[PDB]
């Protein structure tokens, strides 16, 4: 619930950033707005790349840390570690 709320607020603010970026530069805007052009499932898939160090997701480190802590707690409950 709250993870999705924060992610949506993130994308709301990123949309304002890229909409200024469009008025600054139109040619570069493609890569800015690709993750808005993508279907929602693809958007979730690109946004949920916190794992490992590929780290091409545009999400901030604090939001990454929230999911990482939740995943560690879930693994601890599951008994993996």
């Amino acid at each position: 619930d709250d993870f999705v709320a924060k992610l949506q607020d993130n994308q709301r603010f990123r949309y304002n950033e890229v909409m200024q970026a469009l008025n600054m530069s139109a040619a570069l805007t493609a890569r800015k707005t690709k993750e808005f052009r993508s279907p929602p499932q693809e958007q979730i898939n690109m946004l949920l790349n916190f794992k490992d160090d590929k780290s091409e997701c545009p999400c901030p480190e604090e939001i990454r840390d929230q999911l990482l802590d939740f995943h560690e707690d879930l693994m601890t409950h599951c008994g993996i570690e």
């Binding site: 949506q8 994308q11 805007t29 808005f36 929602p40």
Partner: peptide, 19 residues
């Protein structure tokens, strides 16, 4: 082409679908 650039985002998406 701005219309083609702008598609459906999660922030416009409702809560439960995004969940």
């Amino acid at each position: 082409v701005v219309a083609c650039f702008r598609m459906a985002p999660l922030y416009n998406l409702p809560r439960h679908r995004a969940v």
